[PDB]
Amino acid sequence: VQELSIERLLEMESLVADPSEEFQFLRVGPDSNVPPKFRAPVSSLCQIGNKQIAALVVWARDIPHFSQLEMEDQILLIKGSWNELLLFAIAWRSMEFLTERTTSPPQLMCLMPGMTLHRNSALQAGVGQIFDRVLSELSLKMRTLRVDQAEYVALKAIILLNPDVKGLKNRQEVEVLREKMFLCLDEYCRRSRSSEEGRFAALLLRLPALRSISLKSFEHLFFFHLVADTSIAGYIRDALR
């Protein structure tokens, strides 16, 4: 076994997912009220979404000690953070396409390498505010913070490694994994940017801004029957083997 550290993690970010299993967490439900001329694209989008989820489902599991915790929990931890994780990754990628009586709202949201989402489209989908919140509160505000890959993958692990998730067979078994991360991060700020009065907090203060956005993106996803609600634990379960 290895030590859960920023170091091992960064060696996992680069790790490529194994698109071997087709798991639809997201899909256009027959009972969806999404216009017909947009089922192809919205469906196509879900499919991208799905890869990424399985991609984090296999990253989560390759985290130092994560695989040790009791699976039931393991499921619940993931089941409880994918949206947040999914969205956070988008905000990261989006940082590039950031345009940063002088400034206007950003127009691009990078979903995956290459492919991007234009503002006016989200505007056509009635998700322009949430789109806007993702690029401002997250991508932009991060750029400003100059957060780097070490801080970014740390936050990630922190996001996933949440003890407050309801139903945890053994909450403290997660609290340890989190607390370790709280440390690794604090020193990293110390070591690599000690001139920063309150960076540790400014990074951890993205976590709420993120929770809210994710919480909102669920409403929208649900209004459109897009989420495989009742069937996600399973894929999570299933895939975790």
Partner 1 sequence: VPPLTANQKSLIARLVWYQEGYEQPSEEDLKRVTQTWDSDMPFRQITEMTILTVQLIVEFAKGLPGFAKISQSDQITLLKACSSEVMMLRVARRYDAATDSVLFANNQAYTRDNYRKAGMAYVIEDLLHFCRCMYSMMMDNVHYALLTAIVIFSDRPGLEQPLLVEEIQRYYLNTLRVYILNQNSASPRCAVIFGKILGILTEIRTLGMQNSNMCISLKLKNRKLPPFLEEIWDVA
Ligand X SMILES: C/C=C/CC/C=C\CC/C=C/CCCCCCC(=O)OC[C@H](COP(=O)(O)OCCN)OC(=O)CCCCCCC/C=C/C/C=C\CCC
Look at residue 41 and give the partner it binds from ligand X, partner 1, none, a contact being a CB closer than 5 to 8 Å depending on partner kind: ligand X
- Select the residue interacting with ligand X from 57, 63, 75, 127 (CB under 6 A): 127
From the CB of 43, what's the least distance to ligand X, in Å? Answer: 9
Q: Which residues contact 143 (CB under 8 A, 6 or more apart)?
A: 95, 98, 100
Q: Give the DSSP letter string of 42-78.
A: HHHHHHHHHHHHHHHHHHHTTSTTTTTS-HHHHHHHH
* Matching residue, tokens 């009586």: 101
Q: Restricting to residues 26-65, which ones interact with ligand X according to CB under 6 A?
A: 26, 34-35, 38, 41-42, 45-46, 49
- Select the residue interacting with ligand X from 86, 142, 147, 210 (CB under 6 A): 86
DSSP one-letter code for 106: -
Query: Cα 177 from chain centroid?
Result: 18
From the CB of 224, what's the least distance to ligand X, in Å? Answer: 5
Number of CB atoms found within 10 A of residue 37's CB: 7
**Is residue 224 close enough to count as binding ligand X by CB under 6 A?**
yes
Look at residue 61 and give the partner it binds from partner 1, ligand X, none, a contact being a CB closer than 5 to 8 Å depending on partner kind: none
The continuous run of DSSP H or E covering 117 comes out as: strand 116-118
Residues in the site for ligand X, rule: CB under 6 A?
Answer: 26, 34-35, 38, 41-42, 45-46, 49, 83, 86-87, 109, 117, 121-122, 124-127, 130-131, 217, 220-221, 224, 226
